Design a protein around this ligand. Sequence first.
Ligand SMILES: Nc1ncnc2c1ncn2[C@@H]1O[C@H](COP(=O)(O)OP(=O)(O)OP(=O)(O)O)[C@@H](O)[C@H]1O
Ligand SMILES: Nc1ncnc2c1ncn2[C@@H]1O[C@H](COP(=O)(O)OP(=O)(O)OP(=O)(O)O)[C@@H](O)[C@H]1O
Length: 342
Amino acid sequence: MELQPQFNEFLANIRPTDTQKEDWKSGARTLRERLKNFEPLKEIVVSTFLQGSIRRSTAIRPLGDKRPKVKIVVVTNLDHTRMSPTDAMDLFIPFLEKYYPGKWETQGRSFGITLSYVELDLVITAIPESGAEKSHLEQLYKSESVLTVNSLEEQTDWRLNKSWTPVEDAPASEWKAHPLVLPDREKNEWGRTHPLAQIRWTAEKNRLCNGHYINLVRAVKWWRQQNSEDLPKYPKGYPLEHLIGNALDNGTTSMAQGLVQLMDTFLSRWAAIYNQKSKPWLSDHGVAEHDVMARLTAEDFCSFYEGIASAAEIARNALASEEPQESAQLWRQLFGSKFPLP
Ligand SMILES: Nc1ncnc2c1ncn2[C@@H]1O[C@H](COP(=O)(O)OP(=O)(O)OP(=O)(O)O)[C@@H](O)[C@H]1O
Ligand SMILES: Nc1ncnc2c1ncn2[C@@H]1O[C@H](COP(=O)(O)OP(=O)(O)OP(=O)(O)O)[C@@H](O)[C@H]1O
């Protein structure tokens, strides 16, 4: 059966606790307030906004004592053609030493701030556009739509529009073709990322799937976490979320039907790629030219495909079972101890 109440309880059990939520909310608010009132950066920092699976409501709670990774984007007005990423990041060392001495480090393209209950991951970005387009983008990044600390799940009325207040999405000509530039992973060069586009696409897909998309992402992340020793190291994180969003059809009815449908569509759609021992090329919702599966290997994708085949057999039988305890036993075989029984 579908067992929708049990699925709701499982989702509530795999969400980050309200404690951790308030923790990263307070951390982000404090960092933003300190950045806004820092004199040497008052002419540089355009905005500071939350991103990642936390804001997109696609994050699962950490294990053990592990801190929740809080991803923060710092939008500046620097010229990326005349400054390397290391210059932009060096601009922020005084702020860190003043407000987080002994707590901050450089993790390649990000700043890692180890706080008491959370870890703040700060990426330093810039706006490639100039003139009126740059001013309009700065106005958008300083709007309440971007500066919100609540996740997508906490406000279904959220849209990507500078006039939104806690109204539809803004037309695509105002944000789609305008990504930020961030530091590259290895090289000291600027790459392109569009987190706002990703968040807006996630919200749209969740609305098209009747609020089941982010929950299905959480469920598949929890499944991958519980069966980690049988599954490949990757995909996990955003590439996994993208695979799930690609596999899921619109108009999702329930958690169980949506899960079975997404697993079936994943299996049938990539069967040719699997038999060719290859990997899909999937366009990023933020930067169209980017392959989300660029760093994923073919062997890992095929191992994940086999794992999805097994999980899909189990989920099909869990959905087909007409006895509640039987369906629940199969759903727990897929999801583990934190799935409740009727
Ligand atoms: N911490 C982050 N914050 C915002 N965007 C990110 C972050 N990490 C990755 N991205 C986006 O996702 C993509 C994944 O890039 P990854 O770090 O896996 O390899 P890369 O060498 O940076 O990619 P490329 O060379 O293709 O730009 C990046 O192009 C970037 O646009
Ligand atoms: N390969 C990629 N393609 C497109 N966007 C990416 C990619 N990798 C990361 N990003 C973007 O950069 C953000 C930060 O990436 P991070 O390095 O934290 O990976 P992650 O921990 O898997 O992300 P998340 O916290 O969202 O699961 C992600 O939320 C995502 O929006």
